[PDB]
């Protein structure tokens, strides 16, 4: 522009330059305006915020932190500056300072940033677990749970550390809490809950929990596990009723695959076998191709549970995809 006046015109020109990617000119303009000796305190704070955003958009992160730490103490820009600092400390993989800034923000009123505190603590515990130190990982998990008590990641990490320590009873105690903490993520604990119950040997209680999970609409994983245990418990053909019943309420590709396999196991051969082969080779050829987890904020689809969705960088958004497509 440059015909819109002054100071504010400089700010708009710098914003345009940052958007167009001409980072050097954006910093030059904003810094020239900031160094002006004729600016008021409000305008200086605006310039510092714009310069910090410029550095953050240019990737120079420590300079962004330097230009944003001067706005936290200012009432007008406190929340925005703390949010930008939280983003910087997330991106630069410094979880402790990110936790401190998130605690500042939650103290300021924004209570949505407690899940993020739990996730930062879980990430720190993962870093410690990578070095084979279960006590500190447990301490950090406890602190994160105290920060937020509605996070499935904290419970899953607690189960993992308990299984590492061998306190399998406590592992089950922590994992089963995810049923009440978050239903959509129940399927993530079954792979480990099975091992926990096997080590404990409470097979009857394992079956009871699987029955409760399937009755609670946990996903196809619970149904498949329950059917697998039932087949050995009371035969296949006689006990095929349960899979058929669960099928009708919540049909899913991963479920009918098992029913087709059961039909194949005991069939009359002939043309019917050829059919039930060519099919059951196709439902099973798109049971593994389809993505299993989706982010419910930006549409990202992945085959593994990304706690920190790469696209939108939002914590605890990727959840299993439900309905004729997966879990």
């Amino acid at each position: 522009k440059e015909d819109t006046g002054t100071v504010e015109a400089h700010l708009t020109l710098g914003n345009l330059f940052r958007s167009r990617g001409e980072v050097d000119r954006a910093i030059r303009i904003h810094q020239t305006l900031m160094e002006s000796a004729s600016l008021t305190y409000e305008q200086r704070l605006l310039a510092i915020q714009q310069l910090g955003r410029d550095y953050m958009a240019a990737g120079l992160y420590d300079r962004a932190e330097d230009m944003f730490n001067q706005l936290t103490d200012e009432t007008d820009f406190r929340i925005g500056a703390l949010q930008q600092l939280l983003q910087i400390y997330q991106a630069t993989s410094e979880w402790q300072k990110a936790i401190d800034v998130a605690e500042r923000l939650v103290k300021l009123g924004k209570d949505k940033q407690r899940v993020e505190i739990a996730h930062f603590y879980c990430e720190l515990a993962l870093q410690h677990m990578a070095s084979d130190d279960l006590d500190r990982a447990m301490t950090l998990l406890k602190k994160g749970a105290a920060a937020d008590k509605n996070s499935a990641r904290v419970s899953i990490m607690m189960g993992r550390v308990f299984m590492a320590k061998g306190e399998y009873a406590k592992a089950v105690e922590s994992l089963q809490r995810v049923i009440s903490q978050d239903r959509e993520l129940v399927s993530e604990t079954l792979e480990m809950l099975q091992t926990c119950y096997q080590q404990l040997g409470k097979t009857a209680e394992w079956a009871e929990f699987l029955q409760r999970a399937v009755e609670e609409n946990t996903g196809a994983d619970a149904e498949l596990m329950l059917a697998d245990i039932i087949e050995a418990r009371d035969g296949s053909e006689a006990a095929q009723v349960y899979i058929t019943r669960q099928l009708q309420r919540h049909p899913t590709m991963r479920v009918f695959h098992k029913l087709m396999d059961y039909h194949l196991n005991e069939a009359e051969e002939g043309r019917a076998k050829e059919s039930l082969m060519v099919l059951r080779d196709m439902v099973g050829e798109k049971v593994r191709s389809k993505p299993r987890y989706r982010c419910q904020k930006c549409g990202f689809t992945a085959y593994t549970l990304y706690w920190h969705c790469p696209s939108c960088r939002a914590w605890s958004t990727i959840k299993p995809i439900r309905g004729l497509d997966g879990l």
Binding site: G21, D24, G59, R63, Y306, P310, S311, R313
Partner: protein, 301 residues
Amino acid sequence: MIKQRTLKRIVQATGVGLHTGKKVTLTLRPAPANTGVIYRRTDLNPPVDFPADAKSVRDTMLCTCLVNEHDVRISTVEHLNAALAGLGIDNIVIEVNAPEIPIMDGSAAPFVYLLLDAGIDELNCAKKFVRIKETVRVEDGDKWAEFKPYNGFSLDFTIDFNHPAIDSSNQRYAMNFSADAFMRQISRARTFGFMRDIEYLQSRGLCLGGSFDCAIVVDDYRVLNEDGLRFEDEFVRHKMLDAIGDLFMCGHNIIGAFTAYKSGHALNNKLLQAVLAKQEAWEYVTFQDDAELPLAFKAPS
């Protein structure tokens, strides 16, 4: 004759490595005349140095990544090299305390900003260019790179990504290399990746630090970045930026015509090694390239 350039002030910058995700505190430091760009790792108690030689590049899965005999790596040196080649820096000690040059915004503009803020000096010594004498060409199937004799440095890159988001933009860009031309045209194109293969690359230990803030993320059919493309055909421009960076690995500004087609980070280094292996294809010369003096022209209403 063109004079060797270095920096006037040690300049730091803390970014996040694209292919590692670590926090790297890059530090560019001046060096005396006749030293060549030397990379260095600082976190290692004994400081380890990589002289800029084409043979150093040993892993090029997705980024020209130096590796010495003991498997100590400095990856993603293809953008900082691009900025240094654009500004024609001949002696500089680059230090990284983690095994990756930061990515900044994906492009090479932040590195140009850092270098210009440092201030580029002009040592009282001749600048060695590596001028080609005989055509040398190397192919990797459909991909092919070629160096030809010429009175300057001219790039003619090409791209054939079979993708609807990249096929609507000019798949060819040619320029006569020069500091101002580089800073104006190529020094802002960002690294571009596909959101289809980010779940896979991150599983393979690559693109861990990537995000919308440091890459152009073209989905199955269109570019997802909110801002959009900085240019209209940014993809080929960034491919040529990577080409310049990779060609700078020889340690000196090259003189010739570099024409490439679907050339990656491995093909460029293979071409450079082949050119340097032939003693009758290249020679050290002085003062044969176009001006490398940035022009402070922009001064509008």
